[PDB]
Amino acid sequence: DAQMRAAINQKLIETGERERLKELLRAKLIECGWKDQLKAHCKEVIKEKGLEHVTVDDLVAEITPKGRALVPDSVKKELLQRIRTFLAQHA
Amino acid sequence: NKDAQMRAAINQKLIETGERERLKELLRAKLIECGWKDQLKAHCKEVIKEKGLEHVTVDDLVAEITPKGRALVPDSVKKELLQRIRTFLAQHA
Amino acid sequence: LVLSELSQGLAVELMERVMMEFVRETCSQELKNAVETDQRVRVARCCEDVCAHLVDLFLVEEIFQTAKETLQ
């Protein structure tokens, strides 16, 4: 049910938990080199398409699929655990 | 396109400020210092001597002389003019 | 014993939103840097063309004046 999801999301937000998890997620992605991989891929797409042609929308479209696939399953496992811990303590 | 526009803007900025004239006078001074003028006129005297004064024309003279004239310009003089243009540009937006 | 896949869905959505925003920010910054660098390249390059143009112009004139002085 979506109404439940809306209720939880609102809680994550007002409790500041969402902002906190977001910060730690970003920090872990930076730490493991995930962001450096994005930048490396951008450099190649720029060199391939050319600055006279490429836009930000082009880069995102080209880089996203690989980016999504390179998010480590370890951080996804830890995130899920944080969410469950959060639900258990607020419900 | 965009480069041509940028060249035009730089060019116009040099004229509006009077910088083009200062560059011209700068080049003139440097050409004297490196002996460009002296070397060129000696080349003129040689060609005149072969062609003969009567036969030679100035347009004809310019034809055999200009290649040498362009070659006599030292790269250091070119570098120095380039540097002043870049500096000028940094101090004018 | 996980009853519902509600928590799974929340982790997947949250991860996807954070990830997506990070990609957008990264691509925007990388392209901004590249364009800034290229701008410096183009300014330098154009300054070279202008310099070469001015020199050849002033020169074509000085080659005429020199020729004159030698005659007679």
Q: Is-contact A77 C49, C-beta < 8 A?
A: no
Task: Please name the method used to determine this structure.
Answer: X-ray
| Measured distance CA(B48)–CA(B56) in Å, rounded | 7
Resolution of the solved structure (Å): 2.1
- For domain C1-72, the CATH architecture is Helix non-globular (6.10)
Residues 20-49 of A with CB under 8 A from C: 21-22, 25-26, 29, 35, 38-39, 42-43, 46
Contacts of C47 (CB under 8 A, 6+ apart): B10, B82, B85, B86, B89
Residue A39 burial by Cβ neighbours in a 10 Å radius (0-12, 13-18, 19+): middle
* CATH code, domain with B14: 1.10.246.140
| Measured distance CA(A25)–CA(A31) in Å, rounded | 10
Q: Is-contact C65 B24, C-beta < 8 A?
A: no
Domain with A69, as residue range(s), is 1-91
Neighbours of chain B (3+ CB pairs under 8 A): C
The total number of structural domains that make up chain B:
1
Token reading at B93: 């937006």
Query: Under an 8 A CB cutoff, do B11 and C52 touch?
Result: no
